[PDB]
Nucleic acid binder design. Structure first.
Ligand SMILES: Nc1ncnc2c1ncn2[C@H]1C[C@H](O)[C@@H](COP(=O)(O)CP(=O)(O)OP(=O)(O)O)O1
Ligand SMILES: [Mn+2]
Ligand SMILES: [Mn+2]
Ligand SMILES: [Mn+2]
Ligand SMILES: [Mn+2]
Ligand code: NA
Ligand code: NA
Ligand code: NA
Ligand code: NA
Ligand code: NA
Length: 316
DNA sequence: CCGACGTCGCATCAGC
DNA sequence: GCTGATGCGA
DNA sequence: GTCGG
């Protein structure tokens, strides 16, 4: 809420560059600046103040000035009035419509949720589902419901095989009070770097059978993306939620939990002060080189001579 | 001045 | 019918 | 768009 006006402005610019301009490096530039400003412990009084911060340069400092003086950005006003820009931006809010599909839809006069309904025939399976749950997928998930969902996931996974280990990561694991979705990391001792054909399928199938998973967006041997829903009390239906399950080699569990706990910006940063310290971290391993042994998230921190950050202190 | 700035599993579908 | 090219969410 | 070459 502190430099919230500015970070909102920047995120909106980011989204425009990604969805309309298809300029992914400006999108990332804008998010990097929003992130460095969100972490700043002072109320920014000028663009020059922001300019001191890494990731904030000449053009963003100048936009910060306009915003502080005026309480708006003209270019964002100009964007939001443009019919093509605003329509493409809107449509990308549907899961399964990205910058390319949105643009093609808008080009052929399909620019609203009603137009999408009227044109279901031109939608693929993922986009029809994105449209069906358009509102639901934009609602956040209260931590209380994340706990209910957690217990159901871990429980049903155990019912398939007691040796599976399921871990809810993402914002949930960072201790957020609401989450955009549920991300589940799965492991099983039968699956490691060296050694599975139905390991994930068995878990998805069980979750469908107890009617927790309601839809499938994509599913392979290591990655499920779908829809789920907590069961209802006469009382009101819960909204449908996005759920991601990843099946990961047991011996890369800690690098995976680290990565899939995030945040995305944090992961970018840690990777930075690992490269600076003689290391390469990816979702699977830390290497100097062959993969160094790891027995905790802490270890990866130690390696790169960072003090351990709790999941909570990672939402950056 | 200017090149770097994430890579990937999974789904669809022109163009043969 | 097939698959290399492309798009999606991440 | 930004920053280090
Ligand atoms: N661009 C990126 N770079 C590095 N890591 C990335 C990443 N995008 C996602 N991740 C990783 C970390 C997320 O916490 C984790 C989940 O990705 P997610 O897309 O479900 C976003 P999350 O952090 O869970 O918050 P929320 O909005 O869902 O409540 O996957
Ligand atoms: Mn219409
Ligand atoms: Mn998430
Ligand atoms: Mn997710
Ligand atoms: Mn292929
Ligand atoms: Na200070
Ligand atoms: Na700067
Ligand atoms: Na989308
Ligand atoms: Na999301
Ligand atoms: Na420079």
């Amino acid at each position: 809420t502190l430099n919230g006006g500015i970070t909102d402005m920047l995120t909106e610019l980011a989204n425009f560059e990604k969805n309309v301009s298809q300029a992914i490096h400006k999108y990332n530039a804008y998010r990097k600046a929003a992130s460095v400003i969100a972490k700043y412990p002072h109320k920014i009084k000028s663009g020059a103040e922001a300019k001191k911060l890494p990731g904030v340069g000449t053009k963003i400092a100048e936009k910060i000035d306009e915003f502080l003086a005026t309480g708006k950005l003209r270019k964002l006003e100009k964007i939001r009035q443009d019919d093509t820009s605003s329509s493409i931006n809107f449509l990308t809010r549907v899961s399964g419509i990205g910058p390319s599909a949105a643009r093609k839809f808008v080009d052929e006069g399909i620019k609203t949720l009603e137009d999408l309904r009227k044109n279901e025939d031109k939608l693929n399976h993922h986009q029809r589902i994105g449209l069906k749950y358009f509102g639901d997928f934009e609602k956040r998930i209260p931590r209380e419901e994340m706990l209910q969902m957690q217990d159901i996931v871990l429980n049903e996974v155990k019912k398939v095989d007691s040796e599976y280990i399921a871990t809810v990561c993402g914002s949930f694991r960072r201790g957020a009070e609401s989450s955009g979705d549920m991300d589940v990391l799965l492991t099983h001792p039968s699956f490691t770097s060296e050694s599975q054909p139905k390991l994930l399928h068995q878990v998805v199938e069980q979750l469908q059978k107890v009617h927790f998973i309601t839809d499938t967006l994509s599913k392979g041997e290591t990655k499920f993306m779908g829809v789920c829903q907590l069961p209802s009390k006469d009382e009101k239906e819960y909204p449908h939620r996005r759920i991601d399950i990843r099946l990961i080699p047991k011996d890369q569990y800690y690098c995976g939990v680290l990565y899939f706990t995030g945040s995305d910006i944090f992961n970018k940063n840690m990777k930075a002060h690992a490269l600076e310290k003689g290391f390469t971290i990816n979702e699977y391993t830390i290497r100097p080189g062959e993969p160094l042994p790891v027995d905790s998230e802490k270890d990866i921190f130690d390696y790169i001579q960072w003090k351990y950050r709790e999941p909570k202190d990672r939402s950056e």
